[PDB]
Amino acid sequence: YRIXSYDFXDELAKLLRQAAG
Amino acid sequence: YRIXSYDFXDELAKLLRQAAG
Amino acid sequence: YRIXSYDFXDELAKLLRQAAG
Amino acid sequence: YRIXSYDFXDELAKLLRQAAG
């Protein structure tokens, strides 16, 4: 789920992780 | 939209922004 | 924030509200 | 990635996937 060269999918996965400790 | 002190709503907003320039 | 036919901003906002309700 | 009984993780994954095809 990239948006041009931004790794959107991965950044959201990382946000979910960090939000959960 | 928070999980304890983490502002999940704002962090998600910041990603949508960062992914959009 | 659009992806084709999706108002991605609004679809995300829906999931936030569905979950927090 | 749950909020109570709501599987946020999975509903997000489904949204991304469906909006990409």
CSV table of C-alpha atoms in Angstrom, one decimal:
chain,number,residue,atom,x,y,z
A,1,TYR,CA,0.0,0.0,0.0
A,2,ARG,CA,2.6,2.5,-1.0
A,3,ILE,CA,1.8,6.0,-2.1
A,4,UNK,CA,4.5,6.9,-4.6
A,5,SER,CA,7.7,6.1,-2.6
A,6,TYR,CA,6.1,6.4,0.8
A,7,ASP,CA,5.7,3.1,2.6
A,8,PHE,CA,2.1,3.9,3.8
A,9,UNK,CA,1.2,0.3,4.7
A,10,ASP,CA,4.2,-0.2,6.8
A,11,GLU,CA,4.0,3.1,8.5
A,12,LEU,CA,0.4,2.3,9.5
A,13,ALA,CA,1.5,-1.2,10.8
A,14,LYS,CA,4.2,0.5,12.8
A,15,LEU,CA,1.7,3.0,14.3
A,16,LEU,CA,-0.6,0.2,15.4
A,17,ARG,CA,2.3,-1.5,17.1
A,18,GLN,CA,3.5,1.6,18.9
A,19,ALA,CA,0.0,2.6,20.0
A,20,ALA,CA,-0.2,-0.8,21.6
A,21,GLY,CA,3.0,-0.5,23.6
B,1,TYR,CA,-9.0,8.7,19.7
B,2,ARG,CA,-6.3,7.7,22.3
B,3,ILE,CA,-4.8,4.5,23.7
B,4,UNK,CA,-3.7,5.7,27.1
B,5,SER,CA,-1.5,8.7,26.5
B,6,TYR,CA,-0.9,7.9,22.8
B,7,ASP,CA,-3.0,10.1,20.5
B,8,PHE,CA,-3.8,7.5,17.9
B,9,UNK,CA,-6.1,9.9,16.0
B,10,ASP,CA,-3.4,12.5,15.6
B,11,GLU,CA,-0.7,10.1,14.7
B,12,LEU,CA,-2.8,8.6,12.0
B,13,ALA,CA,-3.7,12.1,10.8
B,14,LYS,CA,0.1,12.9,10.7
B,15,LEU,CA,0.8,9.8,8.6
B,16,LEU,CA,-1.9,10.7,6.1
B,17,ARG,CA,-0.3,14.1,5.9
B,18,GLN,CA,3.3,12.8,5.6
B,19,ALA,CA,2.2,10.3,2.9
B,20,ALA,CA,0.7,13.2,1.0
B,21,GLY,CA,3.7,15.5,0.9
C,1,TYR,CA,-7.9,11.9,0.9
C,2,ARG,CA,-9.1,9.8,-2.1
C,3,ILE,CA,-8.2,6.4,-3.5
C,4,UNK,CA,-10.1,6.0,-6.8
C,5,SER,CA,-13.8,5.9,-5.8
C,6,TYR,CA,-13.0,5.7,-2.1
C,7,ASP,CA,-13.0,8.8,0.2
C,8,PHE,CA,-10.3,7.1,2.2
C,9,UNK,CA,-10.3,9.8,4.9
C,10,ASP,CA,-14.0,9.2,5.6
C,11,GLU,CA,-13.6,5.4,5.4
C,12,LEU,CA,-10.9,5.5,8.0
C,13,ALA,CA,-12.9,7.9,10.2
C,14,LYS,CA,-15.8,5.4,10.0
C,15,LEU,CA,-13.6,2.6,11.3
C,16,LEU,CA,-12.4,4.8,14.2
C,17,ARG,CA,-16.0,5.7,15.2
C,18,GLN,CA,-17.3,2.1,14.7
C,19,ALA,CA,-14.6,0.8,17.0
C,20,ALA,CA,-14.9,3.5,19.7
C,21,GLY,CA,-18.7,3.1,19.9
D,1,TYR,CA,-5.4,-5.1,17.2
D,2,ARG,CA,-8.6,-4.9,19.1
D,3,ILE,CA,-10.8,-2.2,20.6
D,4,UNK,CA,-13.1,-4.3,22.8
D,5,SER,CA,-14.8,-6.8,20.5
D,6,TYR,CA,-14.0,-4.8,17.4
D,7,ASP,CA,-11.0,-6.1,15.3
D,8,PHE,CA,-9.6,-2.8,14.2
D,9,UNK,CA,-6.5,-4.3,12.7
D,10,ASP,CA,-8.5,-6.6,10.5
D,11,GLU,CA,-11.1,-4.1,9.4
D,12,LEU,CA,-8.3,-1.7,8.4
D,13,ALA,CA,-6.5,-4.4,6.4
D,14,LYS,CA,-9.8,-5.2,4.7
D,15,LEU,CA,-10.4,-1.5,3.8
D,16,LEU,CA,-6.9,-1.1,2.4
D,17,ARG,CA,-7.2,-4.3,0.4
D,18,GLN,CA,-10.6,-3.6,-1.0
D,19,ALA,CA,-9.8,0.0,-1.9
D,20,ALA,CA,-6.7,-1.4,-3.8
D,21,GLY,CA,-8.8,-4.0,-5.7
